Amino acid sequence: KMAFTLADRVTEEMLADKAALVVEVVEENYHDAPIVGIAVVNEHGRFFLRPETALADPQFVAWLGDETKKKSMFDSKRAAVALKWKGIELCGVSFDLLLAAYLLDPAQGVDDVAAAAKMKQYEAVRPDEAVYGKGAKRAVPDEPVLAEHLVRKAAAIWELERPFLDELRRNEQDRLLVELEQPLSSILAEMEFAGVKVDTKRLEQMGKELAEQLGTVEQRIYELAGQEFNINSPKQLGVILFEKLQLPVLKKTKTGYSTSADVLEKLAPYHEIVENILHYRQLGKLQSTYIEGLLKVVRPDTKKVHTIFNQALTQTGRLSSTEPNLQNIPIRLEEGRKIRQAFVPSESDWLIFAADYSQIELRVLAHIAEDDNLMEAFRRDLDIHTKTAMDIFQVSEDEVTPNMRRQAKAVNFGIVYGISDYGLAQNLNISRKEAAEFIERYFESFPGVKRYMENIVQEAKQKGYVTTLLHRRRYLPDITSRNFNVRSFAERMAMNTPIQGSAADIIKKAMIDLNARLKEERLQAHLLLQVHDELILEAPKEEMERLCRLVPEVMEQAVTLRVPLKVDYHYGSTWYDAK
DNA sequence: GCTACAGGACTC
DNA sequence: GAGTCCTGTAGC
C-alpha cells in the first residue's frame, strides 16, 4: 500500500543531505549481528536497499560517515554499533526518535518506531513484534514484507521529527536532546564496541573453587536436613525450614513462607542448617549469575564482553547495563569482590582507571534544597553520616558510636528515597513512633531539606511532573490517586527523582566533557563503563599521571553547584586493584 | 516442550 | 529510590 522503489543499486539521489535512515538490526543483541535491510527516505523518495549491495558501495558508505549529510534515526546507537562491527563509520545523525520519545515521557516504555509514533497518533506503521513475531517464533519475513516494513519506519521518522522537536522545545528539552543524549549516544556506542577484556582463566578457576565449596555445602545441608532437596526452590526449602524442622515463621510472601536472607539471619540461632544454607545462597549467586554469567557472554575470539547500555529505559535518567550487566558486579563482600580481577585491560602495559563521585545525591540535595547546614557540611567536606548521626542524636564528633553511624547512614539514604516513617522503622529495626522522631530530629537539623521535600510534592501536584537540573521530566499521574499506598509511592518519586536524575544528568555531561578532553589532550585513554556515579577507563600506564589529574577535574566541573563535587580516583592492574 | 511470574540477591 | 538476572514453578 505504501509507495517505494526497491532498488538494485545506489544512486546519487539516495545521498541527499537530509534523510530518514533505517539500518535494521533484528536481534536484540546487536554486537556482530546481521543487518537485514536498509531504508532511506528523503526529499526525493523512498528507497530500500539490500545490505550487501548498499554496504559494498563506496558512495553509500561515504555518505553514511559524512557528518554534513544529516540523518534522522530511531535508536541510532543500535545502528552505529552494527556498522562498527562491519568496519563502517556512521555519522551526522541529528535526530533520534527513541531518545526524543524517551525524553518526552520515559514512562511510555517506547521500544519501537510504532510506539514512538502513537505519541503523535501516527499509525501508518507496524509494531516490530507484528512483523517479526515474539521471542522464539521470531523470524525476518521474505523481502516484500520486510522492505515495506522499513520504508514505513523511515517515513514515520521523516514525518515525526518536526512534532517531537516542536514539543521538546516547548518543554525546554531540546538542548538536552541535542547537546546531551545524542552526543552521549555516540560515546556509549564507542564504549560498547570497545569491549572489556576478561581473564577467562582467572574465571574458570574461581569457577571451579566454587564448585568444590558448593558440593561441600550441598552435602552438609543434606546431612543436616536428613534429606536431599532442591535448595534453589523457594518452595521445598520452606517445607524443610518451617515444616520438617518446625522453625518460627517470621515472614510470609503471597505464595508461602519467606526465605530471604534478611529472614534467614534471624532464624540463624535455631539450627546449623540455616547459616550453611545462607553461605550457599552467596556461593550460588557467584557461581550461577557470575562465573557462568560471564563465561557465557565472552566472545571467545577476542575474549571481551560487550554489554549494551540501554539509554532510553530507566525512569530517572540512569543508564542500564545488559548482557552482560556490568553495573552490578560484586563489591561489598570480599569473596565476591574477587570477580573484579577478571576484568583486565585490553592491551599489554595498560591499566584500569576508576573515578567516582562521593555523595553525588546529597550534594545535589544540598544544592536543590538549599539547606545551609547540608551545604555547609559539604563546604567543610565532612563525613556526612557522622555529621547526621551527630545531629540527629545531639552528641559531639567523638561521641558517635559505630552503630550510631550506620543508623544515620540509613537516615541519609532514607531521606533521599523520601522514606516513610514506618518504612524506616522496618529498615532500621525500631518502633515507628520514634523512628519518626528521628525524621523530625533530622528535619529541624535541616529545615531547607524539609522545605524541598514539601514543595516538591506540591510542585508535582500543581504540574503533573518533576524535573531534574538538565530539564529531564518524569510524569507522576499517581500523585493525586485516592489510594494511600499508591499516592505515597508517587510522592516518594516526586522527592527521589530530581535527585537520582540530577546525578545521571551530571555524570552524562562529565562523559561528554571527558571524551572531548581525552581527545583534545591527544590521549589513548578510553571510557569502558559508567556505573551510575563512577566512570571506568583503561589507558596505557604512561598516562595514569595525567589522568589522576585530568579525570577528577572534568568529572568535578561538569556543572556548577552551590556546593562542590568531589571525585576520588583509583588505578591498578585490573578493575579489582583500582580500589 | 516454551513462556510468563515470583522470590531472591547483586549493584548504585 | 533506580536497575538486571538467575532457578524453579505454575500453566499453556
Side-chain angles (χ1 to χ4, degrees):
Chain A
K1 221 185 319 308
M2 190 181 269
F4 66 96
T5 324
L6 195 169
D8 60 315
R9 80 141 175 116
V10 167
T11 80
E12 210 91 81
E13 62 161 7
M14 310 172 187
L15 303 180
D17 58 26
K18 173 156 208 65
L21 189 74
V22 168
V23 186
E24 196 68 338
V25 184
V26 176
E27 291 213 308
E28 256 203 55
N29 187 341
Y30 47 60
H31 298 287
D32 208 20
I35 293 141
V36 306
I38 294 171
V40 175
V41 165
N42 63 358
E43 153 175 320
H44 302 131
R46 311 194 189 105
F47 314 89
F48 169 81
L49 299 154
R50 296 156 186 98
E52 317 104 33
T53 308
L55 305 163
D57 170 293
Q59 312 86 26
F60 192 66
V61 177
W63 175 90
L64 281 167
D66 177 345
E67 82 176 298
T68 46
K69 306 286 151 211
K70 301 312 189 165
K71 302 115 188 141
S72 300
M73 295 200 60
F74 175 95
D75 190 355
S76 66
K77 141 160 68 57
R78 172 161 280 272
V81 177
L83 285 187
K84 269 180 211 305
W85 277 86
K86 317 282 219 161
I88 300 124
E89 243 190 304
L90 158 76
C91 324
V93 173
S94 80
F95 176 91
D96 195 326
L97 202 39
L98 175 42
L99 301 181
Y102 167 69
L103 292 167
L104 305 160
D105 193 0
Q108 275 294 283
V110 165
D111 71 347
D112 58 39
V113 159
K118 283 261 287 178
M119 279 169 80
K120 304 304 202 144
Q121 294 81 49
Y122 190 105
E123 287 192 15
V125 59
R126 296 170 87 210
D128 289 340
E129 262 231 309
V131 179
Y132 301 130
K134 79 187 200 183
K137 307 225 73 165
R138 185 173 177 67
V140 177
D142 318 322
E143 180 173 288
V145 175
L146 181 64
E148 171 161 358
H149 181 44
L150 312 198
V151 155
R152 292 182 165 276
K153 302 194 307 152
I157 287 153
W158 185 254
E159 277 306 309
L160 295 160
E161 164 164 19
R162 187 38 69 185
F164 277 70
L165 286 160
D166 265 336
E167 195 188 344
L168 283 155
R169 186 109 189 75
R170 261 128 48 202
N171 302 4
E172 274 155 53
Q173 306 171 291
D174 54 306
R175 286 179 84 232
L176 158 70
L177 175 73
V178 186
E179 294 175 10
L180 217 98
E181 309 297 345
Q182 285 174 177
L184 162 51
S185 182
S186 281
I187 294 153
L188 307 162
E190 260 148 62
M191 303 173 49
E192 287 162 1
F193 176 50
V196 180
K197 209 211 175 203
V198 195
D199 182 334
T200 82
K201 291 326 167 101
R202 187 82 245 221
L203 218 39
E204 301 179 308
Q205 209 54 63
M206 284 173 283
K208 225 107 232 333
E209 294 172 325
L210 268 40
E212 245 135 40
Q213 291 183 273
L214 245 105
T216 297
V217 176
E218 192 206 318
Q219 282 311 322
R220 185 75 214 205
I221 280 158
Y222 300 165
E223 223 180 291
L224 274 176
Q227 202 144 339
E228 295 222 346
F229 66 101
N230 202 308
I231 307 148
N232 303 286
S233 157
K235 206 170 228 127
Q236 312 173 38
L237 193 65
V239 153
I240 295 272
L241 291 204
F242 315 94
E243 288 214 8
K244 174 159 188 151
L245 321 168
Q246 290 296 112
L247 270 49
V249 176
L250 299 185
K251 221 193 176 190
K252 281 180 155 156
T253 42
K254 43 159 74 194
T255 343
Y257 309 89
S258 182
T259 64
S260 40
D262 189 53
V263 157
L264 265 75
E265 278 174 344
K266 307 203 200 285
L267 275 140
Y270 298 89
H271 225 279
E272 259 197 78
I273 210 207
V274 188
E275 224 126 41
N276 265 311
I277 283 165
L278 281 140
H279 188 223
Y280 196 101
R281 289 284 184 64
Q282 189 158 68
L283 301 188
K285 185 77 168 175
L286 294 184
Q287 181 79 301
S288 68
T289 301
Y290 289 104
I291 292 358
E292 297 170 353
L294 285 339
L295 285 181
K296 277 200 288 283
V297 251
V298 276
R299 326 294 268 220
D301 51 327
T302 71
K303 280 177 203 181
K304 297 190 228 126
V305 293
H306 303 256
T307 209
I308 287 132
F309 279 116
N310 327 302
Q311 187 189 346
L313 184 172
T314 87
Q315 290 334 289
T316 53
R318 284 209 173 171
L319 287 167
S320 72
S321 211
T322 30
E323 226 188 343
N325 185 359
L326 287 191
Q327 278 179 304
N328 92 313
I329 307 278
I331 180 117
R332 303 265 270 205
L333 287 167
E334 179 59 22
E335 282 207 294
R337 210 169 168 146
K338 278 182 208 287
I339 293 332
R340 305 201 163 205
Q341 324 182 300
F343 296 87
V344 299
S346 58
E347 311 257 351
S348 289
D349 286 315
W350 280 39
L351 292 181
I352 305 294
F353 182 94
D356 53 279
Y357 293 93
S358 183
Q359 234 82 59
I360 188 56
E361 282 166 344
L362 285 173
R363 264 138 147 101
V364 173
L365 184 29
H367 163 80
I368 298 173
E370 293 174 73
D371 184 76
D372 291 311
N373 309 325
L374 211 41
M375 286 184 290
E376 158 73 12
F378 282 120
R379 311 213 183 105
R380 257 140 122 142
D381 190 57
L382 267 151
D383 190 66
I384 200 46
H385 302 293
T386 314
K387 208 276 165 153
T388 295
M390 278 178 42
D391 272 5
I392 74 174
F393 311 133
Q394 324 178 250
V395 291
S396 58
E397 184 173 8
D398 60 344
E399 293 280 270
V400 162
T401 58
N403 200 61
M404 278 163 69
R405 198 208 177 236
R406 94 207 104 203
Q407 305 272 289
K409 190 151 173 191
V411 189
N412 282 314
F413 258 58
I415 286 291
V416 308
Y417 297 173
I419 219 140
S420 30
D421 47 25
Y422 154 98
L424 174 63
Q426 246 285 341
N427 195 213
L428 289 180
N429 262 338
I430 322 297
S431 134
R432 114 163 187 203
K433 170 164 272 158
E434 15 83 336
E437 180 210 52
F438 280 20
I439 297 178
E440 254 311 324
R441 263 195 253 156
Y442 181 104
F443 277 129
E444 57 195 354
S445 225
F446 307 110
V449 162
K450 176 183 179 151
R451 275 169 276 104
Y452 151 95
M453 259 152 53
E454 254 144 60
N455 303 335
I456 191 89
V457 166
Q458 279 327 291
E459 179 164 337
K461 297 203 194 322
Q462 277 98 54
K463 283 178 197 271
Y465 61 91
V466 297
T467 272
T468 65
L469 251 192
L470 293 194
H471 300 154
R472 160 189 335 268
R473 279 178 189 209
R474 177 154 183 212
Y475 289 95
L476 296 172
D478 303 329
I479 204 83
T480 48
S481 152
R482 249 100 325 115
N483 199 248
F484 169 91
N485 267 19
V486 155
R487 171 179 60 245
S488 279
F489 201 10
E491 278 164 325
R492 272 199 278 310
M493 301 176 186
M495 304 176 231
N496 162 276
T497 291
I499 327 252
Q500 215 189 85
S502 277
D505 284 357
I506 290 159
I507 187 149
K508 294 189 220 199
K509 188 137 174 306
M511 292 170 71
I512 301 132
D513 293 351
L514 187 62
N515 194 55
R517 252 291 236 291
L518 292 166
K519 176 194 163 127
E520 183 183 310
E521 289 309 282
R522 324 259 112 110
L523 282 167
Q524 289 191 251
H526 53 85
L527 292 141
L528 270 214
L529 309 162
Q530 171 262 44
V531 181
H532 306 319
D533 74 338
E534 56 212 28
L535 297 176
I536 298 138
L537 293 64
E538 62 157 17
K541 51 207 222 293
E542 294 72 58
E543 291 201 1
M544 300 295 97
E545 283 197 276
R546 295 166 107 309
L547 262 16
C548 298
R549 162 166 273 243
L550 194 69
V551 176
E553 245 283 309
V554 178
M555 279 171 89
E556 273 181 12
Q557 286 179 344
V559 296
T560 287
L561 304 197
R562 275 174 219 104
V563 319
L565 313 174
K566 214 177 77 197
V567 185
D568 295 315
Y569 49 100
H570 274 134
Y571 64 85
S573 264
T574 77
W575 202 356
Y576 169 90
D577 284 287
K579 71 168 158 67

